[PDB]
Amino acid sequence: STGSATTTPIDSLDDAYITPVQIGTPAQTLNLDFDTGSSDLWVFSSETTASEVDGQTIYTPSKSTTAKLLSGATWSISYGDGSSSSGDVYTDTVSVGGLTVTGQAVESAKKVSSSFTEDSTIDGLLGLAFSTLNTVSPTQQKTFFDNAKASLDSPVFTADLGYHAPGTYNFGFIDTTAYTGSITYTAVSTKQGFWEWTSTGYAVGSGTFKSTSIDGIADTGTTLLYLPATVVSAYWAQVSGAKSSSSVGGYVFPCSATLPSFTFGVGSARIVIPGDYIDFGPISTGSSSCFGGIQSSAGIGINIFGDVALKAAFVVFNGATTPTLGFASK
Ligand SMILES: NC1=N/C(=N\Nc2ccccc2)c2ccccc21
């Protein structure tokens, strides 16, 4: 089998992407944030504290004839931005883009933190990291991809995120029309539960490529590109007036600037992030100071190839017995 679904930016800055997912019988369609940096499929629901729901579409398990409460199971997660959510668990039928999994753990939120409530466009998360990170207790549950994998034509999924435009998540096949050149594959470590790999270096604009190993994670659920302070300083030094602002929480730059591109290495291959991808707009409405899309990883503790980087590529998440990651230009 295969599946194919369109993924859409939630706003004009590509702060995150949502993909429609069918849950239950009859189907209840919720727009989920597909997240290769976590491993829980959780949803706003009829169980979510009413004051914590503000415009999201909810899953109502009592209206699904295929829903079953997973007895005794609870979940609780927190994310890199300090947000969190928790609740109980059902199993139900879940379909993405025509690919169906029966008996998928659907984690129903009883509580969500303010950042989730405040974002009416995201109805929950669909985790696509390794199932060793799943938070369900006392019996850890499998991701949608792990449950689907054996049925798929090939044990892979691909992320093709758009810049200010729709894109695609495919399951079970590689669309050879969706990228240019070849796909370069690189090794993955699953020891931290992430799609963790080592970039071979970087360049800033038309500058020379610096060969240096950068270990980090391919995380579709992180918006920005988080890299070592040395690399980030070298990038922003090429932007007149850019500075690291402790009050704002990172590098900012004049909104009037034209940003240089940023290149990262995948083996001997190179992925070029155009400068415009690195502009996250005014820090506050009407300001002429703009937030940068490349930020230091010193605070978060891991380098993160988030959407800023991934949307410049066609990315293969290869779930073969030994997982690997593939990157192509597009
Ligand atoms: N996969 C995720 N990464 C998130 N934040 N990452 C981050 C990195 C550095 C600084 C701040 C946040 C996040 C937030 C909500 C749901 C999923 C995720």
XYZ file of C-alpha atoms and ligand atoms in Angstrom, residues 33-38 42 77-84 115-116 122 125 194 217 219-224 226 295-297 299-302 304, ligand 1:
54
model
C 1.151 18.542 12.610
C 3.272 15.695 11.254
C 6.313 15.688 13.516
C 9.460 13.667 12.798
C 10.795 14.891 16.141
C 8.224 13.155 18.379
C -2.470 13.082 20.004
C 4.415 14.981 26.680
C 6.375 18.218 26.610
C 8.130 19.806 23.668
C 11.132 21.987 22.933
C 9.127 25.227 23.184
C 7.920 24.349 26.681
C 4.448 23.377 25.522
C 2.765 20.216 26.758
C 0.435 27.593 23.023
C -1.746 24.751 21.713
C -3.472 22.630 14.701
C 0.251 16.038 16.352
C 15.323 10.771 16.547
C 18.057 15.778 13.901
C 12.614 17.495 12.739
C 9.566 18.556 10.731
C 7.933 19.754 13.941
C 10.587 22.402 14.672
C 10.129 25.550 12.578
C 13.673 26.896 12.430
C 19.242 25.415 15.048
C 19.394 30.293 15.444
C 21.919 28.943 17.913
C 21.392 25.446 19.317
C 20.142 26.586 24.574
C 18.204 23.558 23.281
C 21.179 21.161 23.527
C 20.942 19.438 20.116
C 17.936 20.715 14.728
N 9.070 18.617 17.191
C 8.891 19.747 17.845
N 9.859 20.646 18.048
C 9.350 21.744 18.779
N 9.973 22.762 19.200
N 11.278 22.821 18.900
C 12.060 23.899 19.355
C 13.425 23.909 19.101
C 14.215 24.947 19.567
C 13.649 25.994 20.257
C 12.289 26.016 20.472
C 11.492 24.963 20.044
C 7.924 21.465 18.992
C 6.907 22.211 19.586
C 5.620 21.682 19.610
C 5.352 20.431 19.061
C 6.362 19.691 18.470
C 7.652 20.225 18.430
